[PDB]
A paper describes a structure:
Following assembly, the anthrax [name] (PA) forms an oligomeric translocon that unfolds and translocates either its lethal factor (LF) or [name] (EF) into the host cell. The toxin functions as a binary A2B toxin, with enzymatic A factors, lethal factor (LF, 91 kDa) and [name] (EF, 89 kDa), and a cell binding B factor, [name] (PA, 83 kDa). Within the endosomal compartment, the acidic environment induces a conformational change in the PA, resulting in the formation of a β-barrel channel that can insert itself into the endosomal membrane. The first α helix and β strand of LF and EF unfold and dock into a deep amphipathic cleft, called the α clamp, which resides at the interface of two PA monomers.
Author numbering:
A (entry chain B), B (entry chain C): 295 to 343
Amino acid sequence: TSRTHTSEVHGNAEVHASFFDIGGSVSAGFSNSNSSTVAIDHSLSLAGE
Amino acid sequence: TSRTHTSEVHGNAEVHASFFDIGGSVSAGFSNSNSSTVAIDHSLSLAGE
């Protein structure tokens, strides 16, 4: 089994360019995650000599 | 065999600075994924000492 925890910072930057319109943009953000993997495995090995 | 639950929490933020039509959007997020992953392996080895 595996349980995780993530952090993140986000950003964006885009300005406008038209015949009349100008602009600008900034941002933020914090993202996380909680992944719960439950892995069930089986194996076989048949060796000879 | 593996069946994975990946829960997510998240926070989001955007803005668009302009003259008078300035737009902003802070936000968040919540998500899960029910990912059932199987994997079938067949292998070999030929060792000689």
